[PDB]
mmCIF file of C-alpha atoms in Angstrom:
data_model
loop_
_atom_site.group_PDB
_atom_site.id
_atom_site.type_symbol
_atom_site.label_atom_id
_atom_site.label_comp_id
_atom_site.label_asym_id
_atom_site.label_seq_id
_atom_site.Cartn_x
_atom_site.Cartn_y
_atom_site.Cartn_z
ATOM 1 C CA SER A 1 6.497 -5.203 -24.816
ATOM 2 C CA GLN A 2 5.751 -4.166 -21.216
ATOM 3 C CA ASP A 3 4.898 -6.183 -18.126
ATOM 4 C CA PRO A 4 1.498 -7.924 -18.251
ATOM 5 C CA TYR A 5 0.870 -6.474 -14.763
ATOM 6 C CA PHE A 6 0.009 -2.978 -16.087
ATOM 7 C CA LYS A 7 -2.960 -4.022 -18.263
ATOM 8 C CA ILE A 8 -4.875 -6.312 -15.832
ATOM 9 C CA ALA A 9 -8.615 -5.880 -15.337
ATOM 10 C CA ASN A 10 -10.029 -7.776 -12.379
ATOM 11 C CA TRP A 11 -7.752 -6.135 -9.860
ATOM 12 C CA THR A 12 -9.541 -8.569 -7.540
ATOM 13 C CA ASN A 13 -6.148 -9.993 -6.624
ATOM 14 C CA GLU A 14 -4.090 -6.840 -6.857
ATOM 15 C CA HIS A 15 -2.024 -7.767 -3.736
ATOM 16 C CA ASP A 16 -0.813 -10.923 -5.438
ATOM 17 C CA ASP A 17 -0.295 -9.525 -8.991
ATOM 18 C CA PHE A 18 1.632 -6.598 -7.529
ATOM 19 C CA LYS A 19 3.690 -8.684 -5.116
ATOM 20 C CA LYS A 20 4.520 -10.820 -8.146
ATOM 21 C CA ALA A 21 5.303 -7.923 -10.507
ATOM 22 C CA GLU A 22 7.504 -6.515 -7.806
ATOM 23 C CA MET A 23 9.537 -9.723 -7.711
ATOM 24 C CA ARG A 24 9.912 -9.819 -11.467
ATOM 25 C CA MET A 25 11.122 -6.238 -11.283
ATOM 26 C CA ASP A 26 13.240 -6.777 -8.182
ATOM 27 C CA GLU A 27 14.868 -9.837 -9.813
ATOM 28 C CA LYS A 28 15.468 -8.212 -13.167
ATOM 29 C CA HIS A 29 17.231 -5.469 -11.247
ATOM 30 C CA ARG A 30 19.392 -7.990 -9.349
ATOM 31 C CA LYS A 31 20.417 -9.458 -12.724
ATOM 32 C CA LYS A 32 21.831 -6.111 -13.774
ATOM 33 C CA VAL A 33 23.588 -5.304 -10.506
ATOM 34 C CA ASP A 34 25.296 -8.674 -10.659
ATOM 35 C CA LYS A 35 26.459 -8.050 -14.195
ATOM 36 C CA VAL A 36 27.954 -4.712 -13.175
ATOM 37 C CA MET A 37 29.576 -5.888 -9.992
ATOM 38 C CA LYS A 38 31.181 -8.697 -12.030
ATOM 39 C CA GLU A 39 32.400 -6.100 -14.527
ATOM 40 C CA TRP A 40 33.851 -4.173 -11.562
ATOM 41 C CA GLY A 41 35.611 -7.345 -10.490
ATOM 42 C CA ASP A 42 37.276 -8.118 -13.802
ATOM 43 C CA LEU A 43 38.172 -4.420 -14.104
ATOM 44 C CA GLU A 44 39.627 -4.340 -10.618
ATOM 45 C CA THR A 45 41.641 -7.565 -10.956
ATOM 46 C CA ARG A 46 43.248 -6.047 -14.057
ATOM 47 C CA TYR A 47 44.337 -3.022 -12.025
ATOM 48 C CA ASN A 48 46.000 -5.307 -9.504
ATOM 49 C CA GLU A 49 47.899 -6.993 -12.327
ATOM 50 C CA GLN A 50 49.175 -3.968 -14.219
ATOM 51 C CA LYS A 51 49.775 -2.271 -10.846
ATOM 52 C CA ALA A 52 53.568 -2.761 -10.778
ATOM 53 C CA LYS A 53 53.929 -3.301 -14.534
ATOM 54 C CA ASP A 54 52.337 -0.089 -15.844
ATOM 55 C CA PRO A 55 51.969 1.958 -12.570
ATOM 56 C CA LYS A 56 51.369 5.114 -14.620
ATOM 57 C CA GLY A 57 49.046 3.728 -17.248
ATOM 58 C CA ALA A 58 47.533 1.477 -14.600
ATOM 59 C CA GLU A 59 46.577 4.284 -12.189
ATOM 60 C CA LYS A 60 44.975 6.334 -14.984
ATOM 61 C CA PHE A 61 42.927 3.196 -15.624
ATOM 62 C CA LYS A 62 41.702 3.128 -12.014
ATOM 63 C CA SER A 63 40.643 6.786 -11.965
ATOM 64 C CA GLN A 64 38.924 6.371 -15.342
ATOM 65 C CA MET A 65 37.095 3.129 -14.475
ATOM 66 C CA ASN A 66 35.833 4.514 -11.148
ATOM 67 C CA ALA A 67 34.210 7.393 -13.009
ATOM 68 C CA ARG A 68 32.554 4.860 -15.297
ATOM 69 C CA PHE A 69 31.533 2.592 -12.453
ATOM 70 C CA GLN A 70 30.378 5.399 -10.190
ATOM 71 C CA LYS A 71 28.267 6.706 -13.064
ATOM 72 C CA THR A 72 26.922 3.311 -14.104
ATOM 73 C CA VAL A 73 25.827 2.583 -10.547
ATOM 74 C CA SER A 74 23.896 5.856 -10.099
ATOM 75 C CA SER A 75 22.401 5.298 -13.530
ATOM 76 C CA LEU A 76 20.993 1.934 -12.346
ATOM 77 C CA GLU A 77 19.881 3.220 -8.945
ATOM 78 C CA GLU A 78 17.790 5.838 -10.706
ATOM 79 C CA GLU A 79 16.116 3.447 -13.082
ATOM 80 C CA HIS A 80 15.129 1.013 -10.301
ATOM 81 C CA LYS A 81 13.812 3.982 -8.355
ATOM 82 C CA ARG A 82 11.957 5.301 -11.388
ATOM 83 C CA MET A 83 10.443 1.909 -12.225
ATOM 84 C CA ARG A 84 9.615 1.247 -8.550
ATOM 85 C CA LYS A 85 7.542 4.401 -8.253
ATOM 86 C CA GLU A 86 5.609 3.772 -11.464
ATOM 87 C CA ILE A 87 4.607 0.329 -10.196
ATOM 88 C CA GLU A 88 3.558 1.826 -6.818
ATOM 89 C CA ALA A 89 1.489 4.724 -8.124
ATOM 90 C CA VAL A 90 -0.449 2.162 -10.162
ATOM 91 C CA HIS A 91 -0.722 -0.248 -7.231
ATOM 92 C CA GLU A 92 -1.854 2.480 -4.814
ATOM 93 C CA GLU A 93 -4.340 3.648 -7.459
ATOM 94 C CA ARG A 94 -5.875 0.181 -7.816
ATOM 95 C CA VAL A 95 -5.897 -0.548 -4.101
ATOM 96 C CA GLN A 96 -7.694 2.744 -3.395
ATOM 97 C CA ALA A 97 -10.155 1.968 -6.147
ATOM 98 C CA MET A 98 -10.688 -1.574 -4.837
ATOM 99 C CA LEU A 99 -11.110 -0.278 -1.281
ATOM 100 C CA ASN A 100 -13.638 2.361 -2.395
ATOM 101 C CA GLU A 101 -15.634 -0.284 -4.275
ATOM 102 C CA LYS A 102 -16.008 -2.353 -1.130
ATOM 103 C CA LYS A 103 -17.138 0.825 0.673
ATOM 104 C CA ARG A 104 -19.615 1.580 -2.083
ATOM 105 C CA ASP A 105 -21.042 -1.909 -2.148
ATOM 106 C CA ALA A 106 -20.794 -2.458 1.624
ATOM 107 C CA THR A 107 -22.923 0.664 1.971
ATOM 108 C CA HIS A 108 -25.596 -0.524 -0.492
ATOM 109 C CA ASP A 109 -26.095 -3.811 1.309
ATOM 110 C CA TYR A 110 -26.304 -1.657 4.483
ATOM 111 C CA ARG A 111 -28.979 0.803 3.461
ATOM 112 C CA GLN A 112 -31.045 -1.935 1.858
ATOM 113 C CA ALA A 113 -30.683 -3.890 5.091
ATOM 114 C CA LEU A 114 -32.227 -0.882 6.814
ATOM 115 C CA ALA A 115 -34.968 -0.155 4.288
ATOM 116 C CA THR A 116 -35.955 -3.835 4.355
ATOM 117 C CA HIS A 117 -36.083 -3.472 8.114
ATOM 118 C CA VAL A 118 -38.674 -0.711 8.115
ATOM 119 C CA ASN A 119 -41.087 -3.415 7.004
ATOM 120 C CA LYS A 120 -39.795 -6.673 8.485
ATOM 121 C CA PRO A 121 -36.985 -7.316 11.046
ATOM 122 C CA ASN A 122 -33.857 -7.485 8.934
ATOM 123 C CA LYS A 123 -32.218 -7.516 12.377
ATOM 124 C CA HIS A 124 -29.147 -9.702 11.766
ATOM 125 C CA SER A 125 -28.628 -8.645 8.163
ATOM 126 C CA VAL A 126 -28.403 -4.987 9.177
ATOM 127 C CA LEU A 127 -25.503 -5.791 11.513
ATOM 128 C CA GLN A 128 -23.575 -8.105 9.158
ATOM 129 C CA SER A 129 -24.022 -5.306 6.668
ATOM 130 C CA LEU A 130 -22.674 -2.654 9.024
ATOM 131 C CA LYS A 131 -19.690 -4.756 10.128
ATOM 132 C CA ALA A 132 -18.821 -5.171 6.462
ATOM 133 C CA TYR A 133 -18.893 -1.423 5.941
ATOM 134 C CA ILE A 134 -16.743 -0.978 9.039
ATOM 135 C CA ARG A 135 -14.202 -3.567 7.921
ATOM 136 C CA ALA A 136 -14.032 -1.654 4.619
ATOM 137 C CA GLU A 137 -13.302 1.767 6.063
ATOM 138 C CA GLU A 138 -10.904 0.289 8.627
ATOM 139 C CA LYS A 139 -9.008 -1.537 5.828
ATOM 140 C CA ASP A 140 -8.650 1.903 4.273
ATOM 141 C CA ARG A 141 -7.114 3.196 7.514
ATOM 142 C CA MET A 142 -4.690 0.297 7.837
ATOM 143 C CA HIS A 143 -3.399 0.782 4.298
ATOM 144 C CA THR A 144 -3.047 4.519 4.697
ATOM 145 C CA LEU A 145 -1.106 4.217 7.944
ATOM 146 C CA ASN A 146 1.043 1.503 6.438
ATOM 147 C CA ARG A 147 1.822 3.715 3.440
ATOM 148 C CA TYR A 148 2.935 6.434 5.874
ATOM 149 C CA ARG A 149 5.058 3.807 7.583
ATOM 150 C CA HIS A 150 6.874 2.645 4.409
ATOM 151 C CA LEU A 151 7.340 6.263 3.319
ATOM 152 C CA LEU A 152 8.710 7.145 6.764
ATOM 153 C CA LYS A 153 11.553 4.653 6.246
ATOM 154 C CA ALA A 154 12.015 5.055 2.467
ATOM 155 C CA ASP A 155 11.840 8.843 2.158
ATOM 156 C CA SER A 156 11.722 10.669 5.527
ATOM 157 C CA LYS A 157 10.847 13.538 3.226
ATOM 158 C CA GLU A 158 8.001 12.164 1.060
ATOM 159 C CA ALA A 159 6.448 11.085 4.378
ATOM 160 C CA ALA A 160 6.357 14.670 5.623
ATOM 161 C CA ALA A 161 4.525 15.786 2.457
ATOM 162 C CA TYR A 162 1.978 13.091 3.213
ATOM 163 C CA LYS A 163 1.312 13.511 6.915
ATOM 164 C CA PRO A 164 -1.212 16.322 6.500
ATOM 165 C CA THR A 165 -2.931 14.010 3.992
ATOM 166 C CA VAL A 166 -2.861 10.975 6.323
ATOM 167 C CA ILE A 167 -4.426 12.913 9.185
ATOM 168 C CA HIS A 168 -7.102 14.116 6.726
ATOM 169 C CA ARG A 169 -7.980 10.612 5.553
ATOM 170 C CA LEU A 170 -8.067 9.172 9.065
ATOM 171 C CA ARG A 171 -10.386 11.991 10.171
ATOM 172 C CA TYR A 172 -12.972 11.440 7.486
ATOM 173 C CA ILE A 173 -12.898 7.683 7.906
ATOM 174 C CA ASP A 174 -13.972 8.236 11.467
ATOM 175 C CA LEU A 175 -16.576 10.800 10.327
ATOM 176 C CA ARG A 176 -18.055 8.502 7.669
ATOM 177 C CA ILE A 177 -18.123 5.592 10.192
ATOM 178 C CA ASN A 178 -19.810 7.703 12.845
ATOM 179 C CA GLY A 179 -22.219 9.144 10.322
ATOM 180 C CA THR A 180 -22.987 5.615 9.229
ATOM 181 C CA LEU A 181 -23.741 4.637 12.860
ATOM 182 C CA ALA A 182 -25.959 7.716 13.160
ATOM 183 C CA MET A 183 -28.202 6.134 10.548
ATOM 184 C CA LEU A 184 -29.480 3.878 13.318
ATOM 185 C CA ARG A 185 -30.842 6.725 15.432
ATOM 186 C CA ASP A 186 -34.168 6.419 13.579
ATOM 187 C CA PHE A 187 -34.731 2.722 14.261
ATOM 188 C CA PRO A 188 -34.951 2.991 18.073
ATOM 189 C CA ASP A 189 -36.125 -0.561 18.149
ATOM 190 C CA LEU A 190 -32.864 -1.468 16.411
ATOM 191 C CA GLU A 191 -30.410 1.162 17.585
ATOM 192 C CA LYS A 192 -30.767 -0.267 21.055
ATOM 193 C CA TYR A 193 -29.579 -3.771 20.182
ATOM 194 C CA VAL A 194 -27.375 -3.471 17.071
ATOM 195 C CA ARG A 195 -25.340 -0.342 17.914
ATOM 196 C CA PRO A 196 -23.421 -1.453 21.041
ATOM 197 C CA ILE A 197 -22.530 -4.570 19.040
ATOM 198 C CA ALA A 198 -21.212 -2.735 15.961
ATOM 199 C CA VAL A 199 -19.308 -0.162 18.064
ATOM 200 C CA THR A 200 -17.420 -2.829 20.018
ATOM 201 C CA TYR A 201 -16.825 -4.647 16.744
ATOM 202 C CA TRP A 202 -15.296 -1.444 15.435
ATOM 203 C CA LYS A 203 -12.982 -1.105 18.441
ATOM 204 C CA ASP A 204 -12.214 -4.828 18.293
ATOM 205 C CA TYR A 205 -11.684 -4.839 14.535
ATOM 206 C CA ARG A 206 -9.379 -1.835 14.662
ATOM 207 C CA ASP A 207 -7.360 -3.375 17.499
ATOM 208 C CA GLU A 208 -6.646 -6.440 15.323
ATOM 209 C CA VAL A 209 -5.907 -4.896 11.944
ATOM 210 C CA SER A 210 -4.096 -1.692 12.858
ATOM 211 C CA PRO A 211 -2.861 -1.845 16.522
ATOM 212 C CA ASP A 212 -0.497 0.630 18.231
ATOM 213 C CA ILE A 213 3.242 -0.281 18.425
ATOM 214 C CA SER A 214 5.945 0.645 20.907
ATOM 215 C CA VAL A 215 9.201 -0.181 19.110
ATOM 216 C CA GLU A 216 9.842 3.262 17.696
ATOM 217 C CA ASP A 217 8.644 6.697 16.676
#
């Protein structure tokens, strides 16, 4: 069989299921490395023994066994890398889907909040609705940046083939958020009191979730 992680369907707790699958994977990998490193140990002790006894036969043994070991290592390193990517592509796919959903639904509650306002003062609801939409888009930003961060340390390369993409996502998030704020322009009554609140919230919310950093670049 495969891991139960790949056929889940609520995705509501993707962070946890993933974090957990990753440990099961990470640990299974550690089990194998240990087994090999132990094999290396028994193999190596044997070389130390036959060193002086069969110097000739012994040395051939060392050369041979390195080849094996070198190869076995690489073999493992590849697999863990192959399996790691598969689990990430999936994860990133769910997370993006989950994030979009929130955007989708945060928007609905928003527009309704507005339509309901045309008639009677949905005042507060409009705002709580907007802030939700903002949180949503900003969560998207945070994750994207973070992905660029991990990739910058994992593969300095993969990161470069992502930068153009990151700058493109971050641009449209701003655009969508501004566009969404523009929707208030028609409710003058409301754009005067809700806007300055949502805008600060946006600056405040971004400051908390995805700051700046000074350590390195």
